[PDB]
Swiss-Prot record, chains A, B:
Protein name per the record: 3C-like proteinase nsp5
Consequence of substituting Q189A: Does not affect ability to cleave and inactivate human TRMT1
Glycyl lysine isopeptide (Lys-Gly) (interchain with G-Cter in ubiquitin) cross-link, chain position(s): K5, K90
Interval of the full protein contained in this chain: 3264 to 3569 of 7096
UniProt gene name: rep
Domain Peptidase C30: 1-306
Compartment annotation: Host cytoplasm; Host Golgi apparatus; Host nucleus
Quaternary context: 3CL-PRO exists as monomer and homodimer. Only the homodimer shows catalytic activity. Interacts with host FBXO22; this interaction promotes the proteasomal degradation of nsp5.
Length: 306, 306
C-alpha cells in the first residue's frame, strides 16, 4: 500500500551522461554508442542567445572546439552535425555502458523521469508530466541544459526529452532527442508564450482510482454523469475534454475497483464544483494530474526493470 | 528555478540489489562486499509471522537453505548470522559494484531516497522523510521487504533504512542496516501503535524559504514572533517545537533571503491559524515538511554526485 510520485531507477541513464564544453559554455550531453547528443546552444555565449543564427555560429566551430568529458576521460570528437535544435558529436569510442534504447516523441499528458545533471554529473531524479501546453514543471538551474527525460520498459530506455530552457514564467521547455521542441518554443532569449495550461483529466481520474485502491474513498458519491455532461464541467474548470479513448484506457482500473468510469467522472465533477472541504486525497489537498493510468497500474502491480 | 521532491540518482544502489529466497519466502537483499543484508523474516512463512521465535526458526536453517541471486547468477552462501532484525549472509564473492558506503542511523525529520524493489530488481525511486513517530509514508507492496533508503555525499552512499513491514494503518516501518527498528516496532504480524505524528517544523520553514527563493511570496507578512510564542501555536497544531538549533540550521537560508527566521515563523503562524485561503505554495495546497534545510540548499545550489 501507499502511493508516491515515483521515478524510474536512473542507473542506465547515469552511465550515458557526459560534460560538453564549447568555448566558455559547458552543459550536459547524452553519450549513446559513438554519438554525444546535446543542445545546439552549447555553441553560444550569453550574448549570442538574444538572436542566434545557429547555422552561422556552427560554421565557425570545428571538431576540436568541442570538449567532451565522461568522468575524467576526454572523448575525441571526429564529426559534428546539427539536427533541428540538437548537436550530434560523433566520438571515436562507443559508450561501453550504452543501454538498450529508443528515441520517442511523447504525447501531452504522458509522464517521464528527469535526471537533473550539472557538468555531466547527476544530481537527482524526479517524475514530470508533459503538460497539455508542452511545458514541464521541473527543477532546473543554470548548467542543467542537456539533462534528459526518459521511461524504462524492462531493459529498454526510451529517451523522450532534452532540457533546453526556462521560460520567463518559470516553467521549462525542451526537445525530443531528434531536437524538435515540444510546443511552439524556440532556442533564444526572448519572451515566449506557453499558452493556457489545462488539467490532464484522464490522469486525475487514474489518480482517483489509485486513491480508492489505497482506501481513500470519502469522495465517492451517489451520482453518475454522461461524457457530454462531464465535459461541460471540464471546459469550465480548464480540464481536457474526456473521450471514449480515455474511458477505454481507464477500463482496467474500473474493472479492478468495480467503479464505472462515468461514476468516477461524477465524483470528480462534485470535487470540482464543491472543492475538497479541507480534506486530502492520497496526502494531497489538490487534484493530482501527473499520474497516467499506466503509472497507477505499474505502481499498484510492482512491475520491475533491469 | 522550480522546486521538486527529488531523489538521489539510484545507480550505485541498483548494483547492490539481490534476490534472497529461503524456503518459499522471497525478498530483497543488499550485497556490499562479501555480505548480503536482508530482513530476518525471510526465514518465516506467513503463519510464522503471527508470533515468530526467530532464534528457534533460524536454528533449523543452514547456509544452503538461503538462495541468493544477483541478476541471473547464484551466489554461494558460506556463513549466516542474525544481527537484531537483519540477517547477514556471507557469500564467497565480493560485489564488484560495491560503492563507497557507510551505515548510518538517521534522526527523525531527516530525509532519504528509497529504491523500491521486487525479486531483487528495482522498480522505482522516491524521496521519504523519517517521520517524528519513526514511520515513513512510502509505496511498498508484498515482496518490497529488503528495499533500502539511502543518502549520497559525492561518491559515498550512506544506507539508513531497510524496509520490513506495513502497519495495519498503511504506514511503513523498518530498521537501520544494523537491524535496529526505527521506533517501537517489532517484526511480527500484530497491531502496533505508531503514535501521534507531528509536523517537522524546521522542514516546513526550510520549504517556505525555498518558496521565497522561487518567487512565491504572497504568504510573507508584516509580523514577527518569539520562539516561545510561535511554540504555543506549534503545540496547538501538532508541530515539533522549534529550538535555537533549528534556528541556527536555517541561518544560511535566512542570510540568502534576507528574512529573519522569527519573521518566517510569524508567517507560518498566520498560515496555521488562517489556512491557505485556496492558494498554493510551490504547487502545493498544504504545508510541506519533507524537505530538510540541507535539501533546499542542495537543490538551489545544484550539488552533484559521482
Ligand atoms: C538550460 C541551461 O542551462 N541554460 N539555458 C540557457 C538559455 C536558454 C535559452 C535562452 C537563453 C539562455 C542558458 C545559456 C547561457 C549561455 C549560453 C547558452 C545557454 C543556460 C546555461 C547556463 C550555463 C551553461 C549552459 C547553459
Ligand atoms: C515487506 C514485505 O514484503 N512483507 N512483510 C511481511 C510481513 C511483515 C510483518 C508482519 C507480517 C508480514 C510479509 C511477509 C509474508 C510472509 C513471510 C514474511 C513476510 C511481506 C512479504 C511478502 C512476500 C515475500 C516476502 C515478504
Amino acid at each position: 500500500s501507499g502511493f508516491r510520485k515515483m521515478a524510474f531507477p536512473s542507473g542506465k541513464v547515469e552511465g550515458c551522461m557526459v560534460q560538453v564544453t564549447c568555448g566558455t559554455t559547458t552543459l550536459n550531453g547524452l553519450w549513446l554508442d559513438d554519438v554525444v547528443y546535446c543542445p545546439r546552444h552549447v555553441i553560444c555565449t550569453s550574448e549570442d542567445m538574444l538572436n542566434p543564427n545557429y547555422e552561422d555560429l556552427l560554421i565557425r566551430k570545428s571538431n576540436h572546439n568541442f570538449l567532451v568529458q565522461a568522468g575524467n576521460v576526454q572523448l575525441r570528437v571526429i564529426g559534428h552535425s546539427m539536427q533541428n535544435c540538437v548537436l550530434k558529436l560523433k566520438v571515436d569510442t562507443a559508450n561501453p555502458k550504452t543501454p538498450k534504447y529508443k528515441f520517442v516523441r511523447i504525447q501531452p499528458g504522458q509522464t517521464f523521469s528527469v535526471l537533473a545533471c550539472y557538468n555531466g554529473s547527476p544530481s537527482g531524479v524526479y517524475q514530470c508530466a508533459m503538460r497539455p501546453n508542452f511545458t514541464i514543471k521541473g527543477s532546473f538551474l543554470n548548467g542543467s541544459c542537456g539533462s534528459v527525460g526518459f521511461n524504462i520498459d524492462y531493459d529498454c530506455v526510451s529517451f523522450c526529452y532534452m532540457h533546453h530552457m526556462e521560460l520567463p514564467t518559470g516553467v521549462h521547455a525542451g526537445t525530443d532527442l531528434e531536437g524538435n521542441f515540444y510546443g511552439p518554443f524556440v532556442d533564444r532569449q526572448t519572451a515566449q508564450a506557453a499558452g493556457t495550461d489545462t488539467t490532464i483529466t484522464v490522469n486525475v481520474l487514474a489518480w482517483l482510482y489509485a486513491a480508492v485502491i489505497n482506501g481513500d474513498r470519502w469522495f465517492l458519491n451517489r451520482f453518475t454523469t454522461t461524457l457530454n455532461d462531464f465535459n461541460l464541467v471540464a471546459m469550465k474548470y480548464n480540464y481536457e475534454p474526456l473521450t471514449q479513448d480515455h474511458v477505454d484506457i481507464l477500463g482496467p482500473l474500473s474493472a479492478q475497483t468495480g467503479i464505472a468510469v462515468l461514476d468516477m467522472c461524477a465524483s470528480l465533477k462534485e470535487l470540482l464544483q464543491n472543492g475538497m472541504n479541507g480534506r486530502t486525497i492520497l496526502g494531497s489537498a489538490l487534484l493530482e494530474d501527473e499520474f497516467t493510468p499506466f503509472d497507477v497500474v505499474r505502481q499498484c502491480s510492482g512491475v520491475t526493470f533491469q
